[PDB]
Amino acid sequence: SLPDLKIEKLDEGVYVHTSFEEVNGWGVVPKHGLVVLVNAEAYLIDTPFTAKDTEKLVTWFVERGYKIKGSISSHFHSDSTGGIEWLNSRSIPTYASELTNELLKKDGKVQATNSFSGVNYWLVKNKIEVFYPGPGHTPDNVVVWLPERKILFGGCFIKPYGLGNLGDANIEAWPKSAKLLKSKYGKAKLVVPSHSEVGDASLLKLTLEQAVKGLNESK
Ligand SMILES: C[C@H](CS)C(=O)N1CCC[C@H]1C(=O)O
Ligand SMILES: [Zn+2]
Ligand SMILES: [Zn+2]
Asked: Which residues make up the binding site for a beta-lactam?
């Protein structure tokens, strides 16, 4: 029996959702996601692994009087995009980078309805920003920045302890992308990784260090 979906407040207008799956060859993997509230509207940062969890997550917010305005997926893997098919079926707007959509189509998965290309994208002006630091954990990975709180959702890019599965990784690119991310978001109050506990800006440094080590052990 896996743990039930968890929803907890991280900051004003910000909640973290945690979902769990048994992953072949990796054991039980926890996935952190965010829900960001603007007025009476709610935005999903990453979907839980499954439609069932995504439906539960949406319901929890709908019950509390919020309209689900949009969803954004950090990268193509199912821990970020699992709910897209369901969200699309409910006509709830879904967002991903053009690269992520290309990779999804490739993986035989349902694509986000809306896509953006380019480094910066403001899902909500002045409140939610998507940033692409370049290839790392995957070619398409992006981070989400909340300026009003200085909270960065690292997603699966942030890897303090180990890089994890390198199957889709760009090992050569990653240290450079990490350096770029650290320079841009060193100011961050909080960093929320996908697969590990919430932390301060130091997670950016650790990720860069891990990325360099991985490339080296790699040579
Ligand atoms: C469900 C995730 C996809 S990012 C996964 O398989 N793993 C494998 C180990 C932890 C985590 C990771 O690569 O970050
Ligand atoms: Zn991944
Ligand atoms: Zn992941």
From this structure: 159, 165
| Model resolution, angstroms | 2.0
Q: How was this structure determined?
A: X-ray
| Catalytic annotation, pick one of 32, 75, 101, 140 | 75
Domain extents in the chain = 1-219
Detail the residues annotated as belonging to a binding site for Zn(2+). Answer: 75, 77, 79, 137, 156, 195
Pocket of ligand 1 contains residue 140 by CB under 6 Å: no
Its sign, for the CA torsion 197, 200, 201, 202, is negative
To test the pocket of ligand 1, the residue of 19, 21, 26, 210 to mutate (highest count of ligand atoms within 8 Å of its CB) is 26
Q: Are the beta carbons of 152 and 188 closer than 8 angstroms?
A: yes
CATH homologous superfamily, domain 1-219: Ribonuclease Z/Hydroxyacylglutathione hydrolase-like (3.60.15.10)
Question: 84 with 110: CB under 8 angstroms?
Answer: yes
